């Protein structure tokens, strides 16, 4: 297969893939729309009781068999729909991740001047409601009336924004060239691309605290509200954010772990990566809410009403902070360069996983010698599918894709995989498999979370989400009926991959009765187990 080589290389490559735009762009606006401090307690509970155990499960699953997201299912051939749904979710995410990266590119290209274009209120696109520190904010007017030229409805396509299309093309070309010339795999300066963001965030942090009114923003960020805790909407949002930030059902974790050595310690790696990834979102939230408190202090409004609940909270808040620093364009350039690097690090692995999965699935040697053409085709398809998101109605489609297609399918897929491993294969067998590599049995906390706690929590969240479903409540953006139907279809497309592949496999399995056919399709194959011959001892002996 090809081992990773050095262990520190794996730890640094996993941190660079886990930390991305979901830490600095997605977390703050979800936290703001979920009433700030009322979102933190479910978030921490979810992280402690569902995220880390499933992260460890995925890493161990990848390491033990030395297979990717589709080859690990020799343990139960009837559950390949899990990997197929993982691939579907990865495609959905990667379609619009590059659109966000291209918006970041556009903001980076506009910082190469002497005076920032979002710093004053006298521009041709400004109105009489403009109000600036040297009502409405100049940054939000720049975001709405100039960068996007937003429409009034999701069904009003309007025209295509040419600069955004150019930025998208540049981003896709950069990704393709870096992938086919091997920038990260056989490359360095992953240390710098892991150290730079914290320096930038620390620089932005000191200025925010000094501001007037930031204390109220911080208090709103930290103070918990106990009234909104009895609602299934906030818990589902917290679970979605936790599973999205760690990449649980993306399929890249298994592929990355497939190159690890047998006796590598995946428990320590999982703990370290989870803590590092989740400690980065809190810093960005601190900075963002300090900026929000300062902004609400001088606009004569409350912290909960200063901004709207759209996805463009970062592109309105961060430029306002960047304005107040001495020599603003340099800091803006550095900040947006850091954002671009954070996005590209995740996009590289996202596309590499799909290409590797396709190449391994096809299986011949002719598809192995034409990997560059496969990568080119995938890149061209992604670029073509991302074009309708650069119109005047693109942010509506992006929001629909974000909070319908890649929110709660990850949790369902992860729970199904955990249940299949624990109750169809047997928990004792998996515990012995883990002890084979680590040398000690998994701690009791992970065992109890794998057998009882996490599946029950996910079941309760899913059950109470449906019962408490209100059309007025679960819309939040006044979308029409057909848009909601499209979002539901996108949500169901990845989940329905499991039951349909189950029937497909059952239609080709020998056995008189259906019960007999259900036992042959769930039995492990003949090649399940350790890859190397020296580790095939005990219950795997020939
Ligand atoms: C092959 C895949 C991976 C990348 C796609 C390459 C092509 C289609 C891309 C790369 C650079 C892009 C161009 C960059 C700049 C501009 C200027 C803008 O005013 C019109 C669009 C235009 C002309 C873009 C159109 C599409 C473009 C030519
Ligand atoms: C049991 C398995 C086989 C099927 C489960 C499918 C159902 C129950 C699940 C899968 C994904 C879930 C959806 C994912 C995302 C959203 C967006 C949210 O804004 C409204 C709820 C909604 C729409 C969820 C409702 C329930 C849902 C549709
Ligand atoms: C993936 C989700 C959203 C779809 C529904 C599947 C889950 C929630 C269901 C299907 C099988 C169920 C599990 C089957 C067996 C047991 C053993 C029991 O001692 C504790 C509950 C537990 C663990 C059940 C809890 C809920 C469960 C995990
Ligand atoms: Cl996060
Ligand atoms: Na990244
Ligand atoms: Na993350």
Swiss-Prot record:
Belongs to the sodium:neurotransmitter symporter (SNF) (TC 2.A.22) family. SLC6A9 subfamily. It comes from Homo sapiens (Human). GO terms for molecular function: amino acid:sodium symporter activity; glycine transmembrane transporter activity; glycine:sodium symporter activity. One of its GO terms (cellular component) is apical plasma membrane. Signal peptide: none annotated. The keyword Hydrolase does not apply. Keywords: Amino-acid transport, Cell membrane, Disease variant, Membrane, Neurotransmitter transport, Phosphoprotein, Symport, Transmembrane, Transmembrane helix, Transport. It comes from the Eukaryota. Interacts with EXOC1; interaction increases the transporter capacity of SLC6A9 probably by promoting its insertion into the cell membrane. Interacts with EXOC3 and EXOC4. The keyword Cell membrane applies. The gene is SLC6A9. It is found in: Cell membrane. This is Sodium- and chloride-dependent glycine transporter 1. GO terms for biological process: glycine import across plasma membrane; glycine secretion, neurotransmission; glycine transport; neurotransmitter uptake; positive regulation of heme biosynthetic process; positive regulation of hemoglobin biosynthetic process; regulation of synaptic transmission, glycinergic; sodium ion transmembrane transport. Disulfide bonds: none annotated. It is a multi-pass membrane protein. The chain crosses the membrane at residues 10-30, 37-57, 89-109, 160-180, 189-209, 234-254, 281-301, 324-344, 380-400, 404-424, 444-464, 484-504. Its main location: membrane. Residues 110-159 are extracellular. It is linked to Glycine encephalopathy with normal serum glycine: An autosomal recessive, severe metabolic disorder characterized by arthrogryposis multiplex congenita, joint hyperlaxity, lack of neonatal respiratory effort, axial hypotonia, hypertonia with pronounced clonus, and delayed psychomotor development. Some patients may have dysmorphic facial features and/or brain imaging abnormalities. Laboratory studies show increased CSF glycine and normal or only mildly increased serum glycine. Most patients die in infancy. Sodium- and chloride-dependent glycine transporter. Essential for regulating glycine concentrations at inhibitory glycinergic synapses.
């Amino acid at each position: 297969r090809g081992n990773w080589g050095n262990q520190i290389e794996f730890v640094l490559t996993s941190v660079g893939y886990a930390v991305g735009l979901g830490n600095v762009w997605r977390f703050p606006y979800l936290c703001y729309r979920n009433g700030g401090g009322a979102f933190m307690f479910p978030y921490f509970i979810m992280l402690i009781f569902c995220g880390i155990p499933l992260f460890f499960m995925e890493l161990s699953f990848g390491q033990f068999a030395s297979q990717g997201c589709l080859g690990v299912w020799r343990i139960s051939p009837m559950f390949k729909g899990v990997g197929y749904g993982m691939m579907v979710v990865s495609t959905y995410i990667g379609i619009y991740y590059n659109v966000v990266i291209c918006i970041a590119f556009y903001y980076f290209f506009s910082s190469m001047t002497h005076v920032l274009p979002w710093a004053y209120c006298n521009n041709p696109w400004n109105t009489h409601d403009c109000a600036g520190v040297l009502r409405t904010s100049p940054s939000e007017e720049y975001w709405r009336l100039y960068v996007l030229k937003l429409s009034d409805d999701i069904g009003n396509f309007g025209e295509v924004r040419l600069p955004l299309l150019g930025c998208l093309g540049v981003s896709w070309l950069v990704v393709f060239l870096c992938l086919i010339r091997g920038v990260k795999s056989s490359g360095k300066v992953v240390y710098f691309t892991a150290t730079f963001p914290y320096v930038v965030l620390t620089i932005l942090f000191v200025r925010g605290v000094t501001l007037e009114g930031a204390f109220d923003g911080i208090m709103y960020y930290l103070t918990p509200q106990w009234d909104k805790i009895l609602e299934a909407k906030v818990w589902g949002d917290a679970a979605s954010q936790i599973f999205y930030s760690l990449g649980c059902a993306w399929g890249g974790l298994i592929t990355m772990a497939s190159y690890n050595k047998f006796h590598n310690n995946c428990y320590r790696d999982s703990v370290i990566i989870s803590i590092t990834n989740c400690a980065t979102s809190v810093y960005a939230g601190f900075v963002i809410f300090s900026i929000l408190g300062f902004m609400a202090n001088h606009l004569g409004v409350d912290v909960s009403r200063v901004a709207d609940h759209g996805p463009g909270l970062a592109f309105v808040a961060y430029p306002e902070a960047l304005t107040l620093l001495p020599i603003s364009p340099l800091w803006s350039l550095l900040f947006f360069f850091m954002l671009i690097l954070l996005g590209l690090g995740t996009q590289f692995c996202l596309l590499e996983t799909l290409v590797t999965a396709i190449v391994d699935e096809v299986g011949n040697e002719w598809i192995l010698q034409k990997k560059t053409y496969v990568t080119l085709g995938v890149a061209v398809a992604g670029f073509l599918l991302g074009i309708p998101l650069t119109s005047q109605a693109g942010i509506y489609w992006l929001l629909l894709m974000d909070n319908y297609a890649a929110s709660f399918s990850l949790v369902v897929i992860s729970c199904i995989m955990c249940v299949a491993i624990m109750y169809i294969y047997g928990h004792r067998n998996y515990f012995q498999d883990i002890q084979m590599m680590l040398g000690f049995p998994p701690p009791l906390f992970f065992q109890i979370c794998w057998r009882f706690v996490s599946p029950a929590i996910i079941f309760f969240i899913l059950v109470f989400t449906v019962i408490q479903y209100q059309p007025i409540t679960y819309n939040h953006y006044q979308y029409p009926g057909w848009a909601v139907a499209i979002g539901f279809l996108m949500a169901l497309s990845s989940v329905l991959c499991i039951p349909l592949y189950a029937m497909f496999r059952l239609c080709r399995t020998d056995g008189d009765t259906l019960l007999q056919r259900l036992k042959n399709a769930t039995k492990p194959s003949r090649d399940w187990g350790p890859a190397l011959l020296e580790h095939r001892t005990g219950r795997y002996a020939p």
